[PDB]
Amino acid sequence: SNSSMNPKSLTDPKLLKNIPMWLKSLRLHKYSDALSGTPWIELIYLDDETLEKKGVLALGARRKLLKAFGIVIDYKERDLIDRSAY
């Protein structure tokens, strides 16, 4: 529905530690079970291909998650994300 990649949630250890929840703000909780087994630090590092391997078969959904992966990384790179999430 939305999946506009909220830089607020994508960089809040609350969601990050709770990937499913992290996906909630991305409308990809659909793949929560497939992406839950993987933390944010790894999620944000995944790729369209890996996502497929998990369960994200939607070229639209996975390739899209790659957008959420970056916003998290950069902010993670800018120490904008609590080291607690790490």
The number of CA neighbours under 13 Å toward the Cβ of 18 is: 9
**CATH code, domain with 28:** 1.10.150.50
Q: After which residues does the chain break, using C–N > 2.5 Å?
A: none
Contacting residues for 62 by C-beta, under 8 A, at least 6 apart: 48, 49, 51, 52, 56
Q: How were these coordinates obtained?
A: NMR
Q: What share of the chain is helix, strand, coil (3-state, %, to 5)?
A: 55, 0, 45
Work out how many domains the chain is built from and give that number: 1
Rounded CA gap, 51 and 59, in Å?
Answer: 10
Q: Is 79 left (phi over 0), alpha (psi -120 to 50) or beta?
A: left
Dihedral sign (CA 31, 35, 36, 39): negative
